[PDB]
Nucleic acid binder design. Structure first.
Lengths: 74, 74
DNA sequence: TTTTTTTTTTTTTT
């Protein structure tokens, strides 16, 4: 929506890689407008010049999600 | 975009819960237009009457993502 | 080869 949305990287979680479009797929915990810190997984430009839209994962989600996912690899 | 997008549930992976909006947060592998089967995490209506937008996770992503995330809870 | 959102969306043949 806005040209530059306010944010801040609280903690880097997982980094996957770039795609054919250069989409840097990563999962990091950032603060929404430098207020609420939460986990959000998105992909950005290869040159890190811009960002895109993905999905936000709350503690409730990440908790149950990781619990099951981690156990799925068992 | 469309009123009803074509799809098919190949395999259910993880089910989180509903939210204050009734958003049923789940992660299941479905076939895009009943063609390409891929993992996609989204939230639907409480009464499962409609669906919404989320994010699609490819094998490359889910693979590295799971590996790291699973190890993160170790 | 999307141009990111301070928690009641109406889903897309990579």
């Amino acid at each position: 929506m806005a040209d530059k949305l306010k944010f801040e990287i609280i903690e880097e979680l997982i980094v996957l890689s770039e795609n054919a479009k250069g989409w840097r797929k990563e999962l990091n915990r950032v603060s929404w407008n430098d207020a609420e810190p939460k986990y959000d997984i998105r992909t950005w430009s290869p040159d890190h010049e811009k960002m895109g839209k993905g999905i936000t994962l709350s503690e409730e989600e990440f908790g149950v999600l990781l619990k099951e996912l981690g156990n799925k690899l068992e």
